[PDB]
Amino acid sequence: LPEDPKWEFPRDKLTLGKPLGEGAFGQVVMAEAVGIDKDKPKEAVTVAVKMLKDDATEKDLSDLVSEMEMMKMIGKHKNIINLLGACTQDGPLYVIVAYASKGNLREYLRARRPPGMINRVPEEQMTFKDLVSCTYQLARGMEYLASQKCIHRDLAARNVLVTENNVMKIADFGLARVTNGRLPVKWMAPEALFDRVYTHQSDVWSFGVLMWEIFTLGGSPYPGIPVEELFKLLKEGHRMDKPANCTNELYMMMRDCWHAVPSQRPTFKQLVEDLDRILTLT
Ligand SMILES: Nc1ncnc2c1ncn2[C@@H]1O[C@H](COP(=O)(O)OP(=O)(O)CP(=O)(O)O)[C@@H](O)[C@H]1O
Ligand SMILES: [Mg+2]
């Protein structure tokens, strides 16, 4: 495994902590990184470390490598979880990213639901403005990703992180690129599912589902519809209903992201424009 000296971080300066999240390509662990942030080279920084699980396969290691390299290409942005360094030599591969203390977006929202709908934070109940602000931030992050020639391909509320300052951060770049068989079906545009094509306009379709996840405060898309039956219903023009806490203005935005003709969906730029207007009148 070849070293990248710009990004390499000394293992002895990294202290691993509690698990934060896990799946079947790797796990995420809280850690402390002494000197990783060279704007403050003396300071310990709380970070997140992505690493293989004990039952990892070779493909898992390959995928983790690809994810690290994709995050080097992406760059830095307010609304994107950023790469801080890596441990690649003499030990397990550690990909060190910024820490988001309030967890993933789906799970921030569900804990901040109104009454009547172990983890609840009722003190921080979501307002309608919080939701549009959430959406504005994520549209900003996607506008930047597209400007850097990057398709995310796995946009979803579970792949958004929330910092201690409630800043939305797009995360999990394991599927990102400059088949499509590994993309979650309920978030995918039909041209991605059917024609094996992925553009920025496919990400705009996923953004619409993400919008729906947000205005349901973390609901599950196409509820009661199994993935197997979703292929047919999309080809017949089915779309999700308006969430209650969603304006019709914002509902038409979702529907514009879900246009059958991809070149006809909004751009992330236009979505940022529109959301900025809506956010200003709340
Ligand atoms: N920088 C971070 N700070 C705090 N928590 C994080 C984090 N990164 C990830 N997590 C937590 O771990 C969860 C999984 O993160 P992530 O989406 O990167 O892994 P993953 O989905 O590729 C696992 P797999 O591919 O094995 O199924 C997140 O939803 C989040 O709750
Ligand atoms: Mg994920």
Author numbering: 468 to 584, 590 to 650, 661 to 764
Please give sentences taken from the publication describing this entry.
Receptor tyrosine kinase (RTK) signaling fulfills fundamental functions in development, tissue homeostasis, and metabolism of metazoan organisms. The FGFR subfamily of tyrosine kinases has emerged as an excellent model system to elucidate the molecular basis underlying allosteric regulation of RTKs in a physiologically relevant and unbiased fashion. Our data reveal two clusters of hydrophobic interactions, termed ‘DFG latch’ and ‘αC tether’, which relay allosteric signals between the A-loop and the molecular brake. These hydrophobic networks, located strategically at the interface between the N- and C-lobes of the kinase, sense the structural fluctuations in the A-loop and molecular brake and undergo rearrangements to determine the kinase interlobe angle and hence kinase activation.
To test this hypothesis, we engineered the following double mutants that combine mutations from two different sites namely: molecular brake and A-loop (E565A/K659M), molecular brake and DFG latch (E565A/I547V and E565A/L617M), molecular brake and αC tether (E565A/D650V, and E565A/M537I), and DFG latch and αC tether (I547V/M537I and L617M/D650V). The activities of all double mutants targeting different allosteric regions were higher than the individual mutants. To provide structural support for the enhanced activities of the pathogenic double mutations, we solved crystal structures for the two most active double mutants (E565A/K659M and E565A/D650V). In agreement with their elevated kinase activities, both double mutants crystallized in an activated conformation displaying an active A-loop conformation, a disengaged molecular brake, a weakened DFG latch and an engaged αC tether. Note that reminiscent of the A-loop phosphorylated activated FGFR2K, the molecular brake is disengaged in the unphosphorylated double mutant. Note that the A-loop in the D650V/E565A double mutant is primarily in an activated conformation. The upper inset to the right shows a close-up view of the DFG latch region showing that the DFG phenylalanine in the D650V/E565A double mutant adopts the same rotamer position as the corresponding phenylalanine in the A-loop tyrosine phosphorylated WT FGFR2K. The lower inset to the right shows a close-up view of the αC tether where hydrophobic contacts are made between V650 and the two methionines in the αC helix. Taken together with our extensive structural and functional results on single mutants, these data on the double mutants further support a four-site long-range allosteric network that controls FGFRK conformational dynamics and activity.
